[PDB]
Amino acid sequence: VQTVTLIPGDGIGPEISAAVMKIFDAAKAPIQWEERNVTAIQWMIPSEAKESMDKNKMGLKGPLKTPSMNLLLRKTFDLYANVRPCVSIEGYKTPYTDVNIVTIRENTEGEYSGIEHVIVDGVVQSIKLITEGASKRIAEFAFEYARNNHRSNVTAVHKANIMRMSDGLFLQKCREVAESCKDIKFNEMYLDTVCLNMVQDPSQFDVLVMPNLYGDILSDLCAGLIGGLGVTPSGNIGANGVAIFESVHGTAPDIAGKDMANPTALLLSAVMMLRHMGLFDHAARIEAACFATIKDGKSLTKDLGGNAKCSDFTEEICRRVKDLD
Amino acid sequence: RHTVTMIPGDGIGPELMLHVKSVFRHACVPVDFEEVHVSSNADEEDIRNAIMAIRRNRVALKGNIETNHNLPPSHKSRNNILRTSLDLYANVIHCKSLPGVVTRHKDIDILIVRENTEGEYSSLEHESVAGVVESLKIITKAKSLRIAEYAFKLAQESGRKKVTAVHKANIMKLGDGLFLQCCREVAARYPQITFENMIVDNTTMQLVSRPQQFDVMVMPNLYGNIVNNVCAGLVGGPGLVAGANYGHVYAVFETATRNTGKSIANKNIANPTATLLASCMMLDHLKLHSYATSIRKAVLASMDNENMHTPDIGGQGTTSEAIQDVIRHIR
Numbered sequence A: 001v002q003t004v005t006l007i008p009g010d011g012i013g014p015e016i017s018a019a020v021m022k023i024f025d026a027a028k029a030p031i032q033w034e035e036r037n038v039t040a041i042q043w044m045i046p047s048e049a050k051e052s053m054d055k056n057k058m059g060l061k062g063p064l065k066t067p068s069m070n071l072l073l074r075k076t077f078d079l080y081a082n083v084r085p086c087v088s089i090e091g092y093k094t095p096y097t098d099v100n101i102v103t104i105r106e107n108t109e110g111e112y113s114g115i116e117h118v119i120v121d122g123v124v125q126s127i128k129l130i131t132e133g134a135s136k137r138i139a140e141f142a143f144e145y146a147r148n149n150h151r152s153n154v155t156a157v158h159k160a161n162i163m164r165m166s167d168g169l170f171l172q173k174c175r176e177v178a179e180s181c182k183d184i185k186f187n188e189m190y191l192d193t194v195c196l197n198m199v200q201d202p203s204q205f206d207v208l209v210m211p212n213l214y215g216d217i218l219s220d221l222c223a224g225l226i227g228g229l230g231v232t233p234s235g236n237i238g239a240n241g242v243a244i245f246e247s248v249h250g251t252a253p254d255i256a257g258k259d260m261a262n263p264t265a266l267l268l269s270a271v272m273m274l275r276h277m278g279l280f281d282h283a284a285r286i287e288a289a290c291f292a293t294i295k296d297g298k299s300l301t302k303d304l305g306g307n308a309k310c311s312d313f314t315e316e317i318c319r320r321v322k323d324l325d
Numbered sequence B: 001r002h003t004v005t006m007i008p009g010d011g012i013g014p015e016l017m018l019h020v021k022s023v024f025r026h027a028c029v030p031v032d033f034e035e036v037h038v039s040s041n042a043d044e045e046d047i048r049n050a051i052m053a054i055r056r057n058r059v060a061l062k063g064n065i066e067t068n069h070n071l072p073p074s075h076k077s078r079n080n081i082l083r084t085s086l087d088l089y090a091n092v093i094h095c096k097s098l099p100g101v102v103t104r105h106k107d108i109d110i111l112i113v114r115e116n117t118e119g120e121y122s123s124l125e126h127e128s129v130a131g132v133v134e135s136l137k138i139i140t141k142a143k144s145l146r147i148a149e150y151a152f153k154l155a156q157e158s159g160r161k162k163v164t165a166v167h168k169a170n171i172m173k174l175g176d177g178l179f180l181q182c183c184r185e186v187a188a189r190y191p192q193i194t195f196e197n198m199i200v201d202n203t204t205m206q207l208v209s210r211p212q213q214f215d216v217m218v219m220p221n222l223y224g225n226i227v228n229n230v231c232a233g234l235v236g237g238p239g240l241v242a243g244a245n246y247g248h249v250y251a252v253f254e255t256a257t258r259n260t261g262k263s264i265a266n267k268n269i270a271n272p273t274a275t276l277l278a279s280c281m282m283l284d285h286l287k288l289h290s291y292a293t294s295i296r297k298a299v300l301a302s303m304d305n306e307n308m309h310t311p312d313i314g315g316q317g318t319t320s321e322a323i324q325d326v327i328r329h330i331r
């Protein structure tokens, strides 16, 4: 019965972290929370935060106010793999009803190398960095994620026609990991064609692995297909077994205390958190109680349709997860 | 009579160029196509003569030349080479809902102006040490001003209202920031046009949920690749949307999404709409407006008949049956 590092964050952060705790309790999840505050100090996150996370190795983070701290946390824990599973939600109607895609995004380098130069006045160079090391690393994670989540297909998304040496190396390491993991079927597709096909028939895609900027964009595109950042879970995998699962929506200060928030997204990142450890059944039941709540449509928060308060939403999940085996 | 360079390209290019000729013949278009081919040869002799032919005719229609991305970096995309050599700095596509092609969204009417020579497409890479590769995205003031001037002039001249610059300046502060700043400089001279900006990630999210909010969109090279394909997909796919590539003196017309279609070539199923509409845009550019309009309205009217649709838009008809209906409607 391990414990997690909880980071409620700001604005609506506490509210939804309260909602997630009450639901994990009603499910009797072997999980209690060690609240901790990350804030830029001295530049670093407080020592009491880095210590809990190196101890428990599992974190659940809500929205922070606006050095970027998700940049700070990434470098601090070597968070090299951003993972966003997107599943259409029964009860939350978007024009895309058959989405089940996991974007797997290299999170350390690529177009986000931090290196730009003014070469001469009016002429700027931004460096895209692709290394054999980090590319192999994110490919191995992609294939490992596919196995452990019973995913049939992985697609490398690239522009090696245009960026031959950089995207080509990324591809070449995806190819190598593929030929040692033939139980998962591997293919390659151009970023623009993935984009073209995604908005027509998203059901054709399974697991997508790609370098940093493409993953940055595509994960938001996919989330737009299923309803937005209010409902989308996210997890970041780091070195030495760390993993932080997170909201990716705003802090919503304009409703920050008024008990109208939607906790769905943080909850599904928590479900994702549980699955990462291995408490599958607790994850399955919490997930099911959430999906059934939105499907039922009686307790919809104001961002998902109906005029129900945040705790009436939380309570219904509570009731339904107590009545499920 | 005008002489126009025609580059058939790969995949479905050749077969669709034959149908452009049939349509042009039946319409008695005063245009002669002068054909240049581009092989897969590592030697740039082919791509180099196609450039000289466009420099001479000033106007071209082209299919997509396949790029083999397993070849060494010295073997560069022939499409990019041609774009850059002729300095066709504006890629312009118009994605508009077709009432006869029903998709998940309607009321879409988006003009995308994409910087077409710079950015992520500069072909500058190296390996300092083994396994460490750098690619150099180049953004310049001169080219960003140029593309922003184009987008605002187009917005004003076609009676549009809003220009949205699409960028990643929050992360690429110096490069995308320069591009954004050049848009702002031009915006100051078009006070009748609303100027807004939006990060490329959020833009894709808004396109799949409320694409009606967008009017004119201007952006550097790779973001334009992404937004072009998202918008084309939203209005029914790659078989429908024409693209233009404009420089100061030259102009090359193509299909918006620049696809070879190798896997459907030589099966009489490719959608000819985008190629045909591209050939009309070329006709307008040649000031052969009455021809352009005759062909375009026949092409657009054929779209209202679901019996004419090819499989890419949910139909069963062949290419030649679609061409037959277009030609029957040119009168």
Ligand SMILES: Nc1ncnc2c1ncn2[C@@H]1O[C@H](COP(=O)(O)OP(=O)(O)OP(=O)(O)O)[C@@H](O)[C@H]1O
Pocket: A012, A063, A230, A249, A250, A251, A252, A253, A254, A255, A260, A261, A262, A263, A303
């Ligand atoms: N979990 C949530 N539940 C309900 N509404 C939310 C939630 N998260 C965000 N919102 C709503 O969406 C917006 C949240 O955006 P937020 O202010 O957090 O940042 P953002 O819009 O992504 O960026 P910025 O801070 O620049 O506006 C608010 O209008 C808020 O009401």
Ligand SMILES: Nc1ncnc2c1ncn2[C@@H]1O[C@H](COP(=O)(O)OP(=O)(O)OP(=O)(O)O)[C@@H](O)[C@H]1O
Pocket: A193, B011, B012, B238, B239, B258, B259, B260, B261, B262, B263, B264, B269, B270, B271, B272, B274, B312
């Ligand atoms: N004019 C067209 N009519 C019908 N389908 C098209 C047309 N142009 C492009 N497509 C389709 O758009 C997609 C993107 O084109 P692309 O050039 O990657 O095709 P391809 O070379 O056939 O790819 P693959 O060999 O992997 O199927 C393909 O599915 C192609 O079939």
Ligand SMILES: [Mg+2]
Pocket: A215, A216, A217, A219, A220, B201
């Ligand atoms: Mg993103």
Ligand SMILES: [Mg+2]
Pocket: B064, B065, B257, B258, B259, B260
């Ligand atoms: Mg192509």
